[PDB]
Enzyme design. Sequence first.
Site, PDB file in Angstrom:
ATOM      1  N   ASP A  35       0.821  -1.206   0.000  1.00 61.43           N
ATOM      2  CA  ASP A  35       0.000   0.000   0.000  1.00 61.43           C
ATOM      3  C   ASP A  35       0.856   1.257   0.000  1.00 61.43           C
ATOM      4  O   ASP A  35       1.353   1.667   1.050  1.00 61.43           O
ATOM      5  CB  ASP A  35      -0.900  -0.015   1.233  1.00 61.43           C
ATOM      6  CG  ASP A  35      -1.799   1.200   1.330  1.00 61.43           C
ATOM      7  OD1 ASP A  35      -1.927   1.926   0.329  1.00 61.43           O
ATOM      8  OD2 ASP A  35      -2.407   1.405   2.414  1.00 61.43           O
ATOM      9  N   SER A 199      -0.713  15.595 -11.994  1.00 63.42           N
ATOM     10  CA  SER A 199      -0.970  15.244 -13.375  1.00 63.42           C
ATOM     11  C   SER A 199      -1.222  16.503 -14.197  1.00 63.42           C
ATOM     12  O   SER A 199      -1.754  17.493 -13.698  1.00 63.42           O
ATOM     13  CB  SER A 199      -2.170  14.298 -13.441  1.00 63.42           C
ATOM     14  OG  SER A 199      -2.577  14.040 -14.781  1.00 63.42           O
TER      15      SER A 199
END
Length: 330
Positions: A35, A199
């Site tokens: 994770d 992004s």
Amino acid sequence: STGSATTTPIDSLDDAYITPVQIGTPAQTLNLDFDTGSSDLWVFSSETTASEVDGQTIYTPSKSTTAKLLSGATWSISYGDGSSSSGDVYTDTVSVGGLTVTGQAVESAKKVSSSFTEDSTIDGLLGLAFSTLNTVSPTQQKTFFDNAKASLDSPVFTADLGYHAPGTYNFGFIDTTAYTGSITYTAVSTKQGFWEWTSTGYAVGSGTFKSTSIDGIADTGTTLLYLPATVVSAYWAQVSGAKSSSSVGGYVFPCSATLPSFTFGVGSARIVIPGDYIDFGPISTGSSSCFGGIQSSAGIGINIFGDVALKAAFVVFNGATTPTLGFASK
């Protein structure tokens, strides 16, 4: 040194991925959920409340000659999905794909929430976010990667998750045969303890690319792709009959649909998520309403590039002095 381990979807939907991890001496192999959005290595154990264990493999520290109780240490964690676990702490030898760390903090669960009990395939979590998020008290502990880093050939790990198929986690090297083209690297903020990056935009299907900054986290422990409501609405508007359902808890779509791809930007590069990666199947057995793999982050407080996005790429978690993230197509 290096390590390399195969990671395998837990079910037909790729709801999560499990990777075998050797703990203790002799080794006890547990299948952990790696994770990159958390920083605790915790396991089902001989200390876990018996009624809360249902099919998981447990770590029994008393059977490990290298286990040592970390005196006074406890841990307690709550995850974004509302699940939780807590317990005490041992140090022991932990190996992943041939890479060994001695003295790793292994957090033994005394209690786990229902979602963990109900998932027989996940024996615990191995956190790969920054150690500043580790919950051990009163002395915070380091992640497996943080402990291994100095020994690694290069201070990196890579995630290569499969779509409906196994993939690979590598430590200490970049497998140049595992991706196409080049790896595009992008800046990371560690301010919130995550692999947080920005992004450069998105496209829906064959549509034009929208240049827009989307701050979010690369999180292998989250199944879906969570993005701003504007972006998510633009995606689902291209699927006839798709709608946001408050009763179901997100966007659903007719199972008869063909889903468009979703592209996200990494600098000037582009990662394309095929439409089929965005299908999470019937909302309930036999239903013709299917659950979407792109959902709104509104009210999460952060955008999450979870498995839906990451499995479309070869992803480098660069733990150099100034960390960065790399993405390649594959």
